[PDB]
Every structure is written in structure tokens, then in C-alpha cells.
Amino acid sequence: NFPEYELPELNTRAFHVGAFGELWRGRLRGAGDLSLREPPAADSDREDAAVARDLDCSLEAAAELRAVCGLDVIPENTDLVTLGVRKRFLEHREETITIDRACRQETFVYEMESHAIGKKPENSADMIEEGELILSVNILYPVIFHKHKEHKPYQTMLV
């Protein structure tokens, strides 16, 4: 069913997860990203033909769309708003801490986040199929420290 909200940013109405996955899979059949294959002059012609077919334009139109819409390092200058605050934070930290080395608690949550993403199965027979509906549940750690009533710790699992 629909994931329709129940509250503005805290809840939604109870919905069947299977029907939700089915709706997503149906509305993405044959025109969806459900391939799960990593990215790789002859192919340019095929791409132009596909663009022409999908957008109802000529081959020359597809070629010029491809050409014009083409894709278009630390120090900065010529500031903007957010680049301004970034540069200021960086210079402040420069007059600040002498050991730039990344904190051991940021690296922890980072590595836990990217522990095993982008690691394909070595069997390739149990690999999940398309539309497998990952639910990112987070289990609340039990209250085993006083500080765990205040800010409720939790561990996230990709069920």
C-alpha cells in the first residue's frame, strides 16, 4: 500500500510491506534500475538511437543532446556562502589542532557504514534478486548505562 504519513515527520500509517515492494517493482518493470550490474564509439550510436526512441527526437537531436549534456582539489577561492563557512571552519581548525588525524570515533561509524557495501557475493547463486526490499531497521540498545536513558543508543541492521 501507500507509505502515506500519519504524522508530519515521525510516523506513517500501517501498510503492508509486501504490497509496497510489489508496487515499486511493478512501476519499475522494464524501465527500472533493477539490473544490479556495475557500470562498464559503436555504443554511441545505440545510445543516440535509444534517446531518439524515448524522447521522440531525431538522431541528430540525440547526438547534440548527448554532446551538450556532457559532464561539466582541496584549496578553494572565489567564495560562496557555504564555501565561505567551510573555508572559515578549515582555517579555524588550522590555527587549532596540531594533529589533523581523523578522530577514532568518526572512523568507527564510517567503517561500520562502509564495512561491506560494494562487496559482491563470491557464490553468485545466492545473490539477491531485483526488488528485494531492504528494510533498514535500527534496534535500540538496552539500558545498560545511565547515559542510555538520555540518548538512546541503537545499532542499525539492513534486514
Add this chain to the structure above:
DNA sequence: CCGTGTGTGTAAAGAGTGAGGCGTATGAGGCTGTGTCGGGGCAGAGGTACTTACCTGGCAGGG
């Protein structure tokens, strides 16, 4: 040249107060009634200069 002895980041506890919203409880209002008791008037004992008049002390005689 590899031991070790001290520093440092930065969010993680550890308290340490403090704050805010919400939900339940309370109240106030006539109403009407009935026992009662402090109460609150209620009056009540009960305790500036000059002049004239009057009083006092004294010494005097009298008997």
C-alpha cells in the same frame, strides 16, 4: 634503532541543574438543603507688657 614516557581529539559518559509542554486535577458558579461552630459586629462596663488682686511672712502691740 628500538624501547618507553608523556600529550592530544573528540565525541562519550557523568553529573548537574533546568526547562517546557501536557495532561490530569481543581475551581467557580447558582441551586437546594441541613447540623454546627466560629465569627463578627454589637454597644457596654470599668478603669508680649502693664496693671490689679490675693496669699504669705514678719514684726508689731496688746491682753
